[PDB]
Every structure is written in structure tokens, then in C-alpha cells.
Amino acid sequence: MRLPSADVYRFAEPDSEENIIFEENMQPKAGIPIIKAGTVIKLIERLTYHMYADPNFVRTFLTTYRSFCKPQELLSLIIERFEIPEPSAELKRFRKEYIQPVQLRVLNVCRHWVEHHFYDFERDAYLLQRMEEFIGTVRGKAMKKWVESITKIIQRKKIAFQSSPPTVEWHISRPGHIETFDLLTLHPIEIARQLTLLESDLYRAVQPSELVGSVWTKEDKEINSPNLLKMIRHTTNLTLWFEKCIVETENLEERVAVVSRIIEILQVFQELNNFNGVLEVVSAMNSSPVYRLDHTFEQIPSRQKKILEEAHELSEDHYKKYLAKLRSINPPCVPFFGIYLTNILKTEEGNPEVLKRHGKELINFSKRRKVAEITGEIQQYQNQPYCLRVESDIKRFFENLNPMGNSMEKEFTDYLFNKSLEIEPRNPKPLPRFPKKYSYPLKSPGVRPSNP
């Protein structure tokens, strides 16, 4: 085929080690080469390639491009790519085999951009002005169908299914009596279900815009990662609430009941595949104030000690068992996000933004593919909801937990540890006795549902 010069159309420049390099493997389901690195022009040529469509590359590119190219600069390149100059029998082939496919591909990119990364347009209303402009100028019977589609999505974006779930379980607290709700008064099955529902919505609300570019670690983390941060803060508040429940229960018999109830909640989190909930309990148990309460743990049934020991092993050997158990299960589940955060950060920190070949800078795409592989792994567990009925009063109770109160982390942390030393002094100080504080019975109703 014969194409115009680089002085009129930049995308016509042929492939070379100076502008594009590949990985030695091919896309498994597509047979398409895997780009390792390339220039922004060559990466945009492959994004809108004439010979074949490359969906994975479109999804990877649109998710991770903002590090190497600005949204307003990308629109201009995909507009420039569409505006093809001509270089009979030769012309009829070029129009059909290179102009029509390349144009169709930029329109597909535009549709993907608008459908899945609309945030770009919500943050730059001129970007949306130019998109609607460009789209308006596009003419052809072939185009009309995709131009109609893009417009229908923009307008939608501007506007902004199961069997019966189980019966909500109750223990001492009766429905409507929020005033009496606490760890031991609510049913442990319902505590775990209601926390799982909360934690599942928190997990499903996290977007790749909050992760790509390691933006949750930067100075504007509160602006760019609000949902991730609410999610981590909920987790932290639950661990702190479990530690507080334990160490503020000074009577050893009552405290043993508290820890046993928390292990019962952990068991139900295991049953529900709530790995975030599982580690909230493990973290609370392995905290400095709790880990040292030997008199409390001596009185805990071996079955519960073993349940806790198995949950802890998930974390061991750099989350080896956790990672296997997650691979072995299917949705719904609430994964532990921390691993994904460390893997995105280390991928971004441990790889160069650019590779140099014959003294020319190539953008390192592989680094972006690896980040995009993790964001996809996050998204694969965000689609499936749980078949559990919400209980609005138990939900609000957990949404409003504030164990720290008005204290700072250190001030609270020290208080928790001092309480731990108070209730179980350091050896050889003998064990003091403390008065009971619960006027209701401590026997658990169990983790097996009372109703079929």
C-alpha cells in the first residue's frame, strides 16, 4: 500500500526500533502483537490501527494514558489521526482499507472514552466542547451510526435481580431499638452481614481514576481518591472499635465473651468471602493492646483459636494463602485492597516512564499494562452484589461508629494500650479483678441461622 509523507500525515511514518518496540509474546485471545514501548504517535496509530481492532489496548490506553499525554493533547491526536489526506484503483483501495477503518477506530476510541472515562470531560468542560464539535463535523453513512451512539452516551452521562435473601437475625436488641445496639446485643450473623454489605458498597465505589498514577499517596489524595480513602477509613474504624470493645471490657469473663463474639463475626465473614472483614478482625487481634491479653486467650475455645489461626495464615508469606483463596473463590466477595495498592505503587515506582532506543524516547507501555492488569483484577470483583437484605438501623450504627471520638491517633492508641496494661498487667504483677459492666446475658446465639 501507498500512504502520504510524514510531513503531511505523521502516522504514515514506518515502524522502527526508534519509534516502536514489541514484547516477544502475542495477545492470547487475539494474535495481535503486545507493544512494550513506543512514541505517542505510534501508540495512537496502534490505538486506531487499520489492519485490526485492539480492544485490550484501547482499555489499557484510556485507563493509563494521563501519565504520558494530557486529555486535551489526546483529543487533538485522535482528531489529527481522523483527518487523513489523500496520497483510480489505488484511491478506491486506500479509502476502503485505510481511511474508513482508521476513522471507525477513532470513533470507537471516542465511544470508549466517553462511556468509561467520562471523568475527563466532567473535569474539563472545554474537552467536552471540542468532542461534541469534532463529532458534529464527522460525515458519512458509515459514521452516522457511531456518531449517534456517542451523542446518546454524552447526554446520558450529562444527566448523571435474584431469589429471596435470608431473614434478618436479631438477638438481645429488638428491631427499632438503636439505643441498645452494641457488639454483644446485635446478632453476630447480622453484624457480619451488615458490615459485609457496607464494605461491599465501599469496595464497588472505588474507581481506577483514584488508583492510576499512585494518586492516593500524593498531596491531593482527598481530592483524587475519596472513595478509596472512605473505604480504608471504615476498615480502620472497625479494627479500632474491636480493640476498644475488648480492652474497655475489664472483667475477664465478659472480655472472653467479647473476643469470642468477634471470632464468631470473623467466621461469618469467612462464610461470606469478606476478606476485608476477616483482616479487620485479624488486625484487631494482632494489635499491641490485644495480642498481649494471655489470660483472655487462655479462656477461648480451641475451635475459635483455630478459626483465628487459620485467618491469620492468610496474611503470612506475603499474602500467599490469601491470594490462593481469592483465586479459588467466585463472586460475591469483598477483597482486601491493600495488596493492589502496594502492587500499583511498586509497579509505577520500580519501572521507568520511558525507554531509550538509538537515543530516542519511547513511552514505556508495559509499565501501564501491568497497572491496568491490577485495575482490571479490582473490577472483576466489583460487579456481583450479595443476596442479603439491608437493615437500615444496623447499617447507620456501623456507618456512624467513631471509636476514636475527638482524639488523635496517638492519644487513642496510647489509651488503648494503657487500658490493656490496666486489665492485664505486665508480669510478675498478679491479675486484678474488675466488676462486670453488662446487665444482659453474654451467651452467644451462635453463627448458625435460627430461621430456614
Partner: protein, 167 residues
Amino acid sequence: HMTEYKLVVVGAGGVGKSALTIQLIQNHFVDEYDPTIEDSYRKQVVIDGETCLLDILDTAGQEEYSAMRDQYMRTGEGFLCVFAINNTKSFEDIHQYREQIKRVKDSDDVPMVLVGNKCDLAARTVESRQAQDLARSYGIPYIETSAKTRQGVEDAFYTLVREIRQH
């Protein structure tokens, strides 16, 4: 069985602490990294002629999970307390990181090393003397490292392995 040392990197976030362990684990002319694979946190090394395995835990990115520190921290034999020489807050945070490590290990003598990392050509706001003074007050070594050039990294880790051995 060769000796396996469980090392824990601790420090403020948002200041390139991850570079330290990455540069250790990856080869001196290999700038590629996949945090997914096992080889990415275990390294065989020869220190003072005696071969050993270094198992490094760096939870870079999980700073907001503050209630998980105690757990992550209790797994370590020795600790690298990292700060950035262009960030005073990260230096001011070392006092509490160290107080936490001591509380978790239930010991005043924990193999520990203070690391001052230079992550960019930004202005140094922490003078080596401030840091050397602080390390002396705590009674631990001080190592400065460069993320750009790999200068100091090996000394930072080997000094900790020496601190564990001499404990």
C-alpha cells in the same frame, strides 16, 4: 538451611520509600520490576562472607491502614526506618514509628537502622547532622541512600543484617 532474615521497612508515605527495596532486589542494570512475583521480595546475599536470605516486607501504599501496623511490624527481626531528606514531616514521624516498633516487640533493643532517602533533585530540608544526631540519641546507625543512583542501598540493608547478628 541458610539463615533467613525477616526485615520490615517502615516510614511515611508519599516520599518514595518503595525505591529503597526495589533497588536492592532488582539487579544494578535491570530497571524492570513486577511486585507480583515471589523473587520480588526475597534475595540471596553474602554479608561479611556469610551467605543468607533477606525476606523484605515493604507495605508502601497501605499507610492509611494504620491499625495494621502492629501486625505487619511484629513479623520483623529488624527494621529500616526510612524518611526523605526533602520532607521534614517524614523525619519528624520517625520518633513514633520507633516507639511503635518497641511497643510491638516489647523491647528497648530492637535491630533497627535509620535511612535518609534522596528521592528527587528537590531541596534537602533535613541535614545529615540532624539525622546523625537523632540516630545517636536512639543508639542506631544512620545511612543515606539515593533513589536515582543506588548509592547507599546495600549499606542500609547490610548494616541492619549486621545489627541483627550483633543483637
